């Protein structure tokens, strides 16, 4: 089914994310884990991003997406929804596009490239392809491990979900 296919693809992109392996003296690069992109960075064709898209009705969502092109003429990206049923290629200003990490940070060698406990993030919600506001609950202990996060969720009396697991590929800085 389309749902299973999307979930597989998602799950697979997460575990193919390369681990940053430096040697003594090296610092983790931009887009390793929590390290932000450089100031005038432009994402490449094929790169995964979180994109703030406004539906036909005006509803705003950060979605998982892939860059198609960037035009220096207008300073806009074209991005594709990672979901086949997302049939629109969106034209987006740079402020609506956050590049996803291009490496996983290893907690055993580069803990400073991980988000800290209680940091506010945008994280991909389980069983969705959309990013939502959440607090870091726990960083990965090992290179293979997900973040644990608490999503903001007004359906709980305290305003937060239980801890949920989100891979490094799918956690970016808020806002």
């Amino acid at each position: 089914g389309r749902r299973g296919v999307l979930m597989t693809l998602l799950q697979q992109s997460a575990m193919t994310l390369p681990l940053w392996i430096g040697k003594p003296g090296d610092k983790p690069p931009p887009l390793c884990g929590a390290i932000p992109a450089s100031g005038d960075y432009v994402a490449r064709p094929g790169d995964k991003v979180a994109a703030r898209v406004k539906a036909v009705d005006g509803d705003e969502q950060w979605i998982l997406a892939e860059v198609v092109s960037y035009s220096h003429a207008t300073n806009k990206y074209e991005v594709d929804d990672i979901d086949e049923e997302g049939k629109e290629r969106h034209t987006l200003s740079r402020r609506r596009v956050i590049p996803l990490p291009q490496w996983k940070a290893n907690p055993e060698t580069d803990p400073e490239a991980l988000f800290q406990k209680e940091q506010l993030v945008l994280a991909l919600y389980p069983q969705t392809t959309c990013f939502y506001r959440a607090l870091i609950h726990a960083p990965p202990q090992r290179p293979q491990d997900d973040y644990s996060v608490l999503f903001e969720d007004t359906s709980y009396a305290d305003g937060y979900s239980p801890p949920l697991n989100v891979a490094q590929r799918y956690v970016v800085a808020c806002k």
Partner: peptide, 4 residues
């Protein structure tokens, strides 16, 4: 996209 698949939303919440």
């Amino acid at each position: 996209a698949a939303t919440k």
